């Protein structure tokens, strides 16, 4: 269920203080955000640590 919007913004008929202060109009656009690439990180650190540990011992 979508949160209510009545009595939230500042208008000429709203007596109460504005609950929400949007910097952009609350109007649906004709597009969606582009897919975000995943910030990859290091891989096989566990295997690298095991190999280096055995190098230290040997």
């Amino acid at each position: 269920a979508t949160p209510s919007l009545r009595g939230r913004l500042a208008r000429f008929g709203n007596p109460r203080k504005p609950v929400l202060k949007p910097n952009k109009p609350l109007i649906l656009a004709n597009r969606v955000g582009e897919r975000r690439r995943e910030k990859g990180e290091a891989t096989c650190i566990t295997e690298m640590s095991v190999m280096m540990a055995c190098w230290k011992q040997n």
Binding site: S4, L5, R6, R8, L9, R11, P25, L26, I27
Partner: protein, 122 residues
Amino acid sequence: PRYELALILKAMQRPETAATLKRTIEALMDRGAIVRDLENLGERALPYRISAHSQQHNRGGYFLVDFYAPTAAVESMVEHLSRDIDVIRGNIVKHPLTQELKECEGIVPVPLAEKLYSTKKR
């Protein structure tokens, strides 16, 4: 008005619990209160450890006291409960039955807000 006292007595024996209950009710009567009824919620482990009167309590006995007292006696009874060493916790609240329940017809739907922005073409 009508107040209800929630009391958490220490996990003592039956004679000690009876004496503590008698002392507590007598203190209410001495402060001009009409004790309507006495209830026994039972003995149970406290949800959290309570340290009061230099004692660490893990189990206690929950009791309820319903009474009618003047508005100038609640504070005196609270002070008496604090000085009592056999009371782990004690709170005096307005009786829930005093406040009636207003009739509810249903969950009225909330219409979606409209005309929040002008109709000029952006």
